[PDB]
Amino acid sequence: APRKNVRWCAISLPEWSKCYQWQRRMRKLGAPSITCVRRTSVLECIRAIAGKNADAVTLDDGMVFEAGRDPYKLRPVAAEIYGTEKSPQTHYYAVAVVKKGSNFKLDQLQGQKSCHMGLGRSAGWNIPVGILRPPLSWTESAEPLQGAVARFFSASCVPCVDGKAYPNLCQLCKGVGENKCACSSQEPYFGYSGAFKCLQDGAGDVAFVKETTVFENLPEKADRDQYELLCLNNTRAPVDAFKECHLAQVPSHAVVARSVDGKENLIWELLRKAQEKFGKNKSQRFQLFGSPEGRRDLLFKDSALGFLRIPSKVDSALYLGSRYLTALKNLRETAEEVKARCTRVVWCAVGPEEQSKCQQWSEQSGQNVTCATASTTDDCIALVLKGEADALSLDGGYIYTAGKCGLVPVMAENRKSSKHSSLDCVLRPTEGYLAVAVVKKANEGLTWNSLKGKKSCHTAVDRTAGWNIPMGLIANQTGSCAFDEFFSQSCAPGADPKSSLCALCAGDDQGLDKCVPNSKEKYYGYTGAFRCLAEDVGDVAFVKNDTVWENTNGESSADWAKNLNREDFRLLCLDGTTKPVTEAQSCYLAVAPNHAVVSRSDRAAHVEQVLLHQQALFGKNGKNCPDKFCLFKSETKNLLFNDNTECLAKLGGRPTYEKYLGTEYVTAIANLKKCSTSPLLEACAFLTR
């Protein structure tokens, strides 16, 4: 096959020649015979994957955030692993390993020389120039960074910058002539083994390299002495204090095979095979991560244990982290332009419908709330992650596919209520909705008892009343997981399309988008999947008490949700009984909490304080709600908020995903999801490491 060989990209001759010390020992041992490719600059290979002639490549992350913009398009396939055995650390650090004697501290890296591994590399630019950034007093509205990081350092050696426009910034560089301060190890001072070396002699001062690079060049312990570091708090510690002198935690280096078509699992297959065979501490007249004396870290960083496998939904922007997605962004983002996005929020509006209502409020705020518009909501809770959306209002199930993803509860869409009418709506706590299974009184041969083989209807796919409680109740008696079987043919807007689950949807009006977790899916939502039984598509349509109530008896608009008589529909109860849409009080499969908004616990605290504002202008008591604009109203379709909800209650405390849902109910999602594995839950509990 024109694909049964991995073309690795080599940037040297000795990394290209380790690659041949490697091409021999492999297919002999048995595996996709490795092709080794000739190249140079860091991108002449991030590009040669993007052009299809060089099929793999191992990078630092400050550079993998780069090989993953939209010009090229490469996802990292294998995270590189660090440390020693009882402790293999899959991420890394970024300190400033200085010589016992230079008395400056980090707040004093002003004017002195320097020593970066590289330009673009995390530990030595994505990490440390925003750590210092404040006195750079670099102007963007005039000059650039690599420009006012020249005014700061009287003399430094960051490789890859232009030797022509940044002289001061290619001065303490020891490379061969045209190879001087160039984007490769051709600059003897390029890397933790070029920037460390940048100081061990005295030429270059602070050396911004990881935590253990001193270690590698300086074997002797009576040698790790002459280097009091520099910490965040303006101090100094030994090369073994790497830990408290960190500046931040960054994922390690990764490997970059194209977004789609770079043969991602041949690339890894060579590595089923590398980590073991020539693993660290096994077969050696060729280690996998090592170049001979006088060359450092060719192919894979010297001394590193190896590679990891990254779960395809996690690519470029995604692996570097959010704590570090604050490094790579910060700088290319002006100083007045970084607050433009901190006194701002972004409403992940799922669709072209949930998106247009946003854009009436993107400016009805005066532009304080903008959009992050995906078309799933498993795509969108992911976007809450990537420094791309503050939050959004998810409904239970989704607070659990965004509860293993790190999202912890802010405000709750406490709708309007009567009990405890007493308080204030914010200060009035969650008196939720009672999940239900309504049918037509026409359906006399149906009571929960008789449900197997009849048709179904389920709001969206994971959620409460339209799934969790239903498919998580149709499993507690039953025994068997496979939810699609209990019911004849159903409409499940969000799951396997060609199944008996979407085997009953409608999509838009043209017929398209049959079965979709975005409202265009006609039979999607509490009101969409209430149409499901309300247009005889199904025998049942799992709902919220209030959906049989607010789309009949003269309440919608709607030519469907109008002529209906609510008292035409019975509420399938739990003891093989049946009560009107009325008696949904003793009857409901189960009571549940309203839908709260979800953003990362660093983005929590502000989306509280903006929404604790817009639920109060265009809030139901909004000065600007029935007249200027009502942030909750939306013609019986419900775009973003419960057409029902009154306010956005205060939840109090800091209730994790778990403690928000109810606990009993939480032990229900986990045990249910033991049956269908979502990919957003795959690479979300991979982001903690």
- Whether 121 has a binding-site annotation, put simply, is yes
302 scored as a contact of Fe ion (CB under 5 A): no
- Whether 524 has a binding-site annotation, put simply, is no
Sign of CA dihedral 79, 93, 83, 215: positive
Residues linked to residue 391 through DSSP beta bridges, in sequence order: 347
396 scored as a contact of Fe ion (CB under 5 A): yes
One of 17, 33, 73, 99 is an active-site residue; which one? Answer: 73
Contact 349, 358 (CB under 8 A): yes
493 scored as a contact of Fe ion (CB under 5 A): no
Give the Cα separation of 102 and 96 in Å (integer). Answer: 12
Place of tokens 């290209």: 16
Q: How many CB atoms lie within 10 A of CB 224?
A: 15
- Whether 395 has a binding-site annotation, put simply, is yes
Which pair of structure tokens corresponds to residue 531? 């149409």
**Taking contact as CB under 5 A, which single stretch among the options 195-203, 456-464, 553-561, 674-682 is the one that binds Fe ion?**
456-464
Give the Cα separation of 206 and 191 in Å (integer). Answer: 13
413 scored as a contact of Fe ion (CB under 5 A): no
State the nearest-atom distance from the C-beta of 469 to Fe ion, in Å: 9
547 scored as a contact of Fe ion (CB under 5 A): no
- Whether 124 has a binding-site annotation, put simply, is yes
Sign of CA dihedral 213, 214, 220, 221: negative
**Taking contact as CB under 5 A, which single stretch among the options 393-401, 449-457, 470-478, 634-642 is the one that binds Fe ion?**
393-401
Which pair of structure tokens corresponds to residue 519? 């409202």
- Whether 463 has a binding-site annotation, put simply, is yes
Toward Fe ion, which CB reaches closer, 155 or 532? Answer: 532
Residues 562-621 that bind Fe ion (CB under 5 A): none
527 scored as a contact of Fe ion (CB under 5 A): no
- Whether 531 has a binding-site annotation, put simply, is no
Give the Cα separation of 159 and 183 in Å (integer). Answer: 5
Give the Cα separation of 282 and 393 in Å (integer). Answer: 52
- Whether 68 has a binding-site annotation, put simply, is no
- Whether 433 has a binding-site annotation, put simply, is yes
Contact 246, 106 (CB under 8 A): no
329: annotated active-site residue:
no
Sign of CA dihedral 610, 614, 620, 621: positive
State the nearest-atom distance from the C-beta of 60 to Fe ion, in Å: 3
Give the Cα separation of 524 and 520 in Å (integer). Answer: 8
Residues 95-154 that bind Fe ion (CB under 5 A): 122-123
Phi-psi region of 367 (alpha: psi -120 to 50; beta: other; left: phi over 0): left
- Whether 526 has a binding-site annotation, put simply, is yes
646 scored as a contact of Fe ion (CB under 5 A): no
- Whether 166 has a binding-site annotation, put simply, is no
Contact 594, 432 (CB under 8 A): yes
Toward Fe ion, which CB reaches closer, 122 or 156? Answer: 122
416: annotated active-site residue:
no
Please select the residue that binds Fe ion; options are 15, 55, 60, 211, rule is CB under 5 A. 60
Toward Fe ion, which CB reaches closer, 395 or 608? Answer: 395
CA 172 to centroid of chain Cα atoms: 39
CA 145 to centroid of chain Cα atoms: 28
**Taking contact as CB under 5 A, which single stretch among the options 175-183, 258-266, 395-403, 441-449 is the one that binds Fe ion?**
395-403
**Taking contact as CB under 5 A, which single stretch among the options 168-176, 387-395, 531-539, 563-571 is the one that binds Fe ion?**
387-395
One of 259, 303, 488, 634 is an active-site residue; which one? Answer: 259
Residues 217-246 that bind Fe ion (CB under 5 A): none
Helix (H) or strand (E) holding 75: strand 74-76
| Identity at 650, one-letter amino acid code | K
80 scored as a contact of Fe ion (CB under 5 A): no
Sign of CA dihedral 640, 590, 542, 681: positive
State the nearest-atom distance from the C-beta of 544 to Fe ion, in Å: 7
- Whether 459 has a binding-site annotation, put simply, is yes
Best CA proximity match to 686, nearest among 310, 359, 146, 185: 310
State the nearest-atom distance from the C-beta of 253 to Fe ion, in Å: 5
**Taking contact as CB under 5 A, which single stretch among the options 28-36, 358-366, 377-385, 461-469 is the one that binds Fe ion?**
461-469
State the nearest-atom distance from the C-beta of 59 to Fe ion, in Å: 8
58 scored as a contact of Fe ion (CB under 5 A): no
Nearest-Å Rg of the Cα atoms of the chain is 30
Which residues have CB under 8 Å from 29's CB, separation 6+? 273, 277
466 scored as a contact of Fe ion (CB under 5 A): no
State the nearest-atom distance from the C-beta of 415 to Fe ion, in Å: 11
Toward Fe ion, which CB reaches closer, 430 or 464? Answer: 464
395 scored as a contact of Fe ion (CB under 5 A): yes
State the nearest-atom distance from the C-beta of 123 to Fe ion, in Å: 5
**Taking contact as CB under 5 A, which single stretch among the options 56-64, 77-85, 193-201, 366-374 is the one that binds Fe ion?**
56-64
545 scored as a contact of Fe ion (CB under 5 A): no
State the nearest-atom distance from the C-beta of 368 to Fe ion, in Å: 27
Toward Fe ion, which CB reaches closer, 362 or 645? Answer: 645
State the nearest-atom distance from the C-beta of 531 to Fe ion, in Å: 18
Q: Is 639 helix (H, G, I), strand (E, B) or coil?
A: coil
State the nearest-atom distance from the C-beta of 264 to Fe ion, in Å: 22
Give the Cα separation of 457 and 31 in Å (integer). Answer: 49
Q: Is 497 helix (H, G, I), strand (E, B) or coil?
A: coil
- Whether 465 has a binding-site annotation, put simply, is yes
Number of residues that bind Fe ion (CB under 5 A): 6
Q: Is 625 helix (H, G, I), strand (E, B) or coil?
A: coil
- Residue environment code for 563-597, b if the CB has 16+ CB neighbours within 10 A, otherwise e: ebebebbbbbbeeeebebbeebeebbbbebbbbbb
Rounded to 10 degrees, the C-alpha dihedral 589/590/594/598 comes to: -100
Contact 530, 536 (CB under 8 A): no
**Taking contact as CB under 5 A, which single stretch among the options 239-247, 279-287, 457-465, 554-562 is the one that binds Fe ion?**
457-465
Toward Fe ion, which CB reaches closer, 464 or 645? Answer: 464
- Whether 377 has a binding-site annotation, put simply, is no
464 scored as a contact of Fe ion (CB under 5 A): yes
DSSP alpha helix (H) spans, 45-154: 61-64, 133-136
Place of tokens 């149709």: 474
Q: Which residues are annotated as a binding site?
A: 60, 92, 121, 123-124, 192, 253, 395, 433, 459, 463, 465-466, 526, 595
Q: Which residues are annotated as a binding site for hydrogencarbonate?
A: 121, 123-124, 459, 463, 465-466
> Hey, which residues are catalytic here?
73, 259
Q: Which residues are annotated as a binding site for Fe(3+)?
A: 60, 92, 192, 253, 395, 433, 526, 595
Residues near Fe ion (CB under 5 A): 60, 122-123, 395-396, 464
